[PDB]
Design a protein around this nucleic acid. Structure first.
Ligand SMILES: [Cl-]
Ligand SMILES: [Cl-]
Ligand SMILES: [Mg+2]
Ligand SMILES: [Mg+2]
Ligand SMILES: [Mg+2]
Ligand SMILES: [Mg+2]
Ligand SMILES: [Mg+2]
Ligand SMILES: [Mg+2]
Ligand SMILES: [Mg+2]
Ligand SMILES: [Mg+2]
Ligand SMILES: [Mg+2]
Ligand SMILES: [Mg+2]
Ligand SMILES: [Mg+2]
Ligand SMILES: [Mg+2]
Ligand SMILES: [Mg+2]
Ligand SMILES: [Mg+2]
Ligand SMILES: [Mg+2]
Ligand SMILES: [Mg+2]
Ligand SMILES: [Mg+2]
Ligand SMILES: [Mg+2]
Ligand SMILES: [Mg+2]
Ligand SMILES: [Mg+2]
Ligand SMILES: [Mg+2]
Ligand SMILES: [Mg+2]
Ligand SMILES: [Mg+2]
Ligand SMILES: [Mg+2]
Ligand SMILES: [Mg+2]
Ligand SMILES: [Mg+2]
Ligand SMILES: [Mg+2]
Ligand SMILES: [Mg+2]
Ligand SMILES: [Mg+2]
Ligand SMILES: [Mg+2]
Ligand SMILES: [Mg+2]
Ligand SMILES: [Mg+2]
Ligand SMILES: [Mg+2]
Ligand SMILES: [Zn+2]
Lengths: 105, 159, 56, 204
RNA sequence: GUCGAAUUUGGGUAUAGGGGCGAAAGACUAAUCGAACCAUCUAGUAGCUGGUUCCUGCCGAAGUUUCCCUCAGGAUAGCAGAAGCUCGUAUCAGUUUUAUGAGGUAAAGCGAAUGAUUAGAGGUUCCGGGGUCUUGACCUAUUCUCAAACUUUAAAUAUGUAAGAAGUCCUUGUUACUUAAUUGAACGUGGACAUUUGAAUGAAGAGCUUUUAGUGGGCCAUUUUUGGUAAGCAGAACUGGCGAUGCGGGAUGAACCGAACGUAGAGUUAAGGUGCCGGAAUACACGCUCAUCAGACACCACAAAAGGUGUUAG
RNA sequence: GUGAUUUCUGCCCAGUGCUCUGAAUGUCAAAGUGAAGAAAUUCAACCAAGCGCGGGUAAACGGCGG
RNA sequence: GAAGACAUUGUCAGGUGGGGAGUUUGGCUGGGGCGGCACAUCUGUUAAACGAUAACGCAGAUGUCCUAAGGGGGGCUCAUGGAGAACAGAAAUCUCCAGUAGAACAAAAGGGUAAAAGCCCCCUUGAUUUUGAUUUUCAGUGUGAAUACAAACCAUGAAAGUGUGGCCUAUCGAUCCUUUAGUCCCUCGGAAUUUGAGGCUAGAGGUGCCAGAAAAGUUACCACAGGGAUAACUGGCUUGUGGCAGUCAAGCGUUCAUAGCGACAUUGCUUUUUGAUUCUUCGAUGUCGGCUCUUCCUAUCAUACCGAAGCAGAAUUCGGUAA
RNA sequence: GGUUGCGGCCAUAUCUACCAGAAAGCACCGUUUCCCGUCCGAUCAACUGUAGUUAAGCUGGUAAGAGCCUGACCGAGUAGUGUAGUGGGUGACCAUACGCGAAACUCAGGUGCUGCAAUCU
């Protein structure tokens, strides 16, 4: 699928409260912290004798991940998130469809 | 596996009538519906929005809500050993006024007219419908209508 | 070992022991799902006619 | 390699014709349904004799083929090559299935063709001259042994293969309302434009 | 079998249980060995098998829905009991009627669409091919035969709603909704119309709440119906039964026919019977049948194609 | 491991193991070292054996087709 | 004498470690296994004209694809056939006529659609924000999908209007944890500032056994609880298959259907074959064959008496009464 | 009654082949400076009502016309179907009892009706 890098949409930024211009990017998770409470608990539980104390998922079935777009307002820099359907190939660049031409080579 | 989609088994139910395809006539959109009206549900296959589920095909209900291009209808549905109230949001293309009670209104009007007509002089106006009664006696004349004798006919092949 | 899959035998007889109850009808039914704009004005209309009868 | 006919005698299943859902049906054993002098004029063969079923059953395409050969062979030998017109009035369109090897996945493969006949349904029709009545009746009598169930031979009171009684057909032809069109005829109606109904049937 | 040796054997001594010992068989380790014996943890856990102790009275089931590493088990809804509560025929009904809807099955149809399909006939080519005229291909008018996943038409049986007081009519109050507009919408004040008050029949009263048992292997018969050559086979639909049920009948039999049960007396019947067994006419009446394998009563305990100057009627 | 004597024990080191006075800038723990921050901390460089790479080995396990 | 701050020993860290320990090693299923997915879903049919309805029934499909193939507006009309135009031919481009859709609409199928829902062109991001109600599966829980409004902000068009993704019917995911956005709000409990951590609201990372445990084999050394709810013998139902017997008569037989045979078809019988089924038995009915011994059936190999022949004799062949 | 604008039901209105049409209306028709749109002022836009024509559109009538519509004790109380019997039949299936009741076929008739506004021998 092809999605433009710019889109006009509602901005609930307490100063816009209306449709504004937004920059479009792709969401990325980010590194997990070593001092999150869930991480601190896991390290304590895993220490000592007893082996692995939590399940480890193996039976993967999905072949795709949902794409999330991060929309940043150009005026107030307020971010928003949108989720698209599952797809195998995703791009943000241009190269729009040509209406009709001869198939080269 | 089995298939139980929303429009399952509706191959013939939602089809248009023969030589009756195309756009809907304007009289469908000009009728007015009010809360308390009695309507019956018949889906139109050419209008995919606001279409009822196949269960409510051929059912009759009472309007409870009026919106821009649709009405709200109440249907009593039998589930298990009881009846549950169902509320439907249907566009006007799929409904029409029911005549199961419009014919009843004129009987109320005629009862009042007959009651007032006999009020000044008559008693026992008898404003109750009665079932068909056994025929009374009559005399059948044979003048020009002498009975014709009939007999069973023999078996013939005539193939 | 294979067993039976499905049947509706005896189900109607069970439903008729105490069932088939027509729904109870009430005056003043619930206004759930009614158009919010109509209900906003209907509330104001009822307050106005309450004052008139009380002050009559 | 073929099961006995008692295994498929009765109409137990719904009709199962050759279609885009089968696509693998073998050909029928009978391919010719008109025998004798099929070019004969309607006025040539006034007498009609039928072989009529008296049971609700199925007739295999092998049985139809065998009975057709027996009837044609006898009548040709006795009466003559061009002295009758024999028509088979049943076409085998029902496909039979056979389960070849427990009961898991028992849906069978196509096995053959059969024709589903009703009570009083015509199976064979023969038209010939009046003087040739006894020959064609005996030919149909010998064909009954190839079929299961009970069949009856009835002398029709129609004119040949037409749907009109013999006196009624004679009435129309003397009025110039019958035109010969191949082996069959066309009739003149009271409807339609006179411009077409005049060039046809000029004698009327 | 072996019998002077890798011989046989007494006593002493060493190796102890995931250990020992084994010229190796998972062999032997006190009648115990693919991990000894003894006591304790220990009344170890079991969706699995067995058993579970007095009487009478009243009511009285389920093998079905959804979810579960769920398929010999549970939860959940249903069916059942008990406790009642609010009321006193209000209103309701496994039913009919009248008025008004919905459906695409049985049947029917193919010189109606789609798809199959037999046979000619009249026409058509600078647009199939042999030959200087034939077979194919379409065109037009006809003709024989078909469809669970074809159809114009279209039942029967089932199925939605309505038949009044929460109704109808006359007048005019409220609003921030709606209208060009006191226009409309919705909800109200006041007046008029009583139970032949708006069809039939019935109604050991109607409405309502809490709580909890068992059950969640079913099976059979008529009709509809799928797979299979078929099955006392496998799987569905509606209803009635068995299971949970004796009693009269079918000799005998869970399901068929009749009929359902407090203790007795009398009378009358059901289904089935009345030569004898065996309660009841070796009754009445018109015919048919003679078998050197007659026949004899639904479910049901089998017989066919094809034949006979046997006999009878047509 | 094979199993007196006699006679003979062929070809295959790609795979799985075993082995090497082989190579270096692959992967790489704790401690230690550096930078940043007010600190908790974070990042980076360096980095043992093993692994990887290279050689040897079938009377090692095994293989000997179209 | 040797050896020396190195070995050794102590504590952490990385590797190696079936030598050893603990545990696991789906379900449905005409027994189980192998296969398959009927395990989460969609179209048509089976389905018996409301709704609901089974089988490892029948014919297929889904874990995708699209900045347009989404939204609005305008103009236009398709498949196919006929008659024509240099190269040009059955198929290149141009013109006219006929054309109810026989085209097209991402995909399976069924519906739907013609001044359109199809084709071309112009403009756009409503595939947006907040939080409720409703329909389907249903326990009237969840999840998925879908319908109609309310309050905002926008797109398009002269305008009425239309638009909360794809013409409609499938295209998908809890708790815990992690992470992002929002609000910059609440808490760190002796009092404050700044980091850090923890909460509130909305998404993402996935469980396909799809209401969602983290999981390899073998036992012919075997164990226990059970099961005739379920397989390996008889018996019972069935008879496809096996075996046996009729009917018809095109033909074989030098002539000549039927002495003896007999195609194409068709009706049965038998339980001495094998399947199908799973009713009885798993707190046990001793399991192949032979040996020994008795009796029964007749579909008769021999013996008794007969009929028939393409029966001269001889020999043989067909049939009857007969166990 | 004719005609025009906007309609309702959506073939009794459609289709094929012909014939006729006073008045007005509608239409064809004339032109390219302007707004506007095309390869083409053909379509679309604008201007004139002047130069012409009822030829076509349009409306009506005609046809043992096709289609369509309505009715018929035409077919037919037939096919099918609810309920019942210890009815028939080896079976396949069938008859009867109390009810409901088609389609094709055949024949006959019909060939748009109508609402609002304006206008015309
Ligand atoms: Cl049951
Ligand atoms: Cl010891
Ligand atoms: Mg540790
Ligand atoms: Mg949509
Ligand atoms: Mg069960
Ligand atoms: Mg038979
Ligand atoms: Mg089969
Ligand atoms: Mg010794
Ligand atoms: Mg061993
Ligand atoms: Mg105990
Ligand atoms: Mg114990
Ligand atoms: Mg009781
Ligand atoms: Mg048990
Ligand atoms: Mg259907
Ligand atoms: Mg039919
Ligand atoms: Mg149980
Ligand atoms: Mg069973
Ligand atoms: Mg029991
Ligand atoms: Mg008996
Ligand atoms: Mg006696
Ligand atoms: Mg040696
Ligand atoms: Mg140490
Ligand atoms: Mg182990
Ligand atoms: Mg299993
Ligand atoms: Mg249905
Ligand atoms: Mg689209
Ligand atoms: Mg503190
Ligand atoms: Mg699940
Ligand atoms: Mg798991
Ligand atoms: Mg059993
Ligand atoms: Mg056989
Ligand atoms: Mg015993
Ligand atoms: Mg014994
Ligand atoms: Mg024993
Ligand atoms: Mg009965
Ligand atoms: Zn902003």
């Amino acid at each position: 699928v092809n999605v433009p890098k710019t889109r006009k949409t509602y901005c609930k930024g307490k100063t816009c409260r209306k449709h504004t211009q937004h920059k479009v990017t792709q969401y990325k998770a980010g590194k997990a912290s070593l001092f999150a409470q869930g991480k601190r608990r896991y390290d304590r539980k895993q220490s000592g004798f007893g082996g692995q104390t939590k399940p480890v998922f193996h039976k993967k079935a999905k072949t795709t991940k949902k794409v999330v777009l991060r929309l940043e307002c150009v005026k107030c820099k307020t971010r928003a998130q949108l989720t698209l359907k599952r797809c195998k190939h995703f791009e943000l660049g241009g190269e729009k469809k040509q209406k009709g031409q001869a198939l080269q080579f | 596996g089995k298939s139980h989609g929303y429009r399952s088994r509706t191959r013939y139910m939602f089809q248009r009538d023969f030589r009756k395809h195309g756009a809907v006539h304007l009289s469908t959109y000009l009728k007015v519906y009010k809360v308390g009206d009695i309507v019956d549900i018949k889906a139109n296959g050419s209008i995919q929005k606001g279409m009822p589920h196949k269960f409510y095909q051929g059912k009759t209900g009472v309007v409870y809500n009026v919106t821009k291009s649709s009405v709200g209808v109440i249907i009593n549905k039998m589930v298990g050993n009881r009846y549950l109230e169902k509320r439907l949001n249907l566009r006007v293309e799929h409904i029409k006024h029911s005549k199961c009670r419009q014919e009843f209104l004129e009987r109320v009007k005629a009862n009042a007219a007959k009651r007032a007509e006999a009020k000044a002089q008559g008693v026992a106006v008898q404003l109750k419908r009665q079932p068909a009664q056994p025929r009374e006696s009559r005399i059948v004349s044979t003048e020009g209508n002498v009975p014709q004798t009939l007999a069973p006919v023999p078996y013939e092949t005539f193939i | 070992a294979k067993s039976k899959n499905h049947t509706a035998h005896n189900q109607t007889r069970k439903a008729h022991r105490n069932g088939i109850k027509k729904p109870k009808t009430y005056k003043y039914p619930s206004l759930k799902g009614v158009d919010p704009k109509f209900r906003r004005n209907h509330k104001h209309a009822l307050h106005g006619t309450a004052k008139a009868l009380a002050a009559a | 390699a073929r099961r006995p006919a008692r295994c498929y005698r009765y109409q137990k299943n719904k009709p199962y014709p050759k279609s885009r859902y089968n696509r693998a049906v073998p050909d029928s054993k009978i391919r010719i349904y008109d025998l004798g002098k099929k070019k004969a004029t309607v006025d040539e063969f006034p007498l009609c004799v039928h072989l009529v079923s008296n049971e609700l059953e199925q007739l295999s395409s092998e049985a139809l083929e065998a009975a057709r050969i027996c009837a044609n062979k006898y009548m040709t030998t006795v009466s003559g090559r061009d002295a009758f017109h024999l028509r088979v009035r049943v076409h085998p369109f029902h496909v039979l299935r056979i389960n070849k090897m427990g009961m898991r996945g028992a849906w069978g493969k196509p096995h053959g063709l059969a024709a589903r006949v009703d009570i009083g349904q015509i199976i064979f029709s023969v038209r010939t001259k009046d003087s040739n009545k006894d020959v064609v009746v005996e030919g149909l009598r010998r064909a009954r042994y190839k079929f299961p169930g009970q069949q009856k031979i009835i002398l029709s009171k129609k004119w040949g293969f037409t749907n009109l009684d013999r006196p009624e057909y004679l009435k129309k032809r003397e009025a110039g309302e019958v035109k010969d069109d191949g082996a069959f005829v066309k009739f003149l109606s009271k409807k339609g434009s006179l411009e077409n109904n005049i060039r046809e049937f000029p004698e009327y």
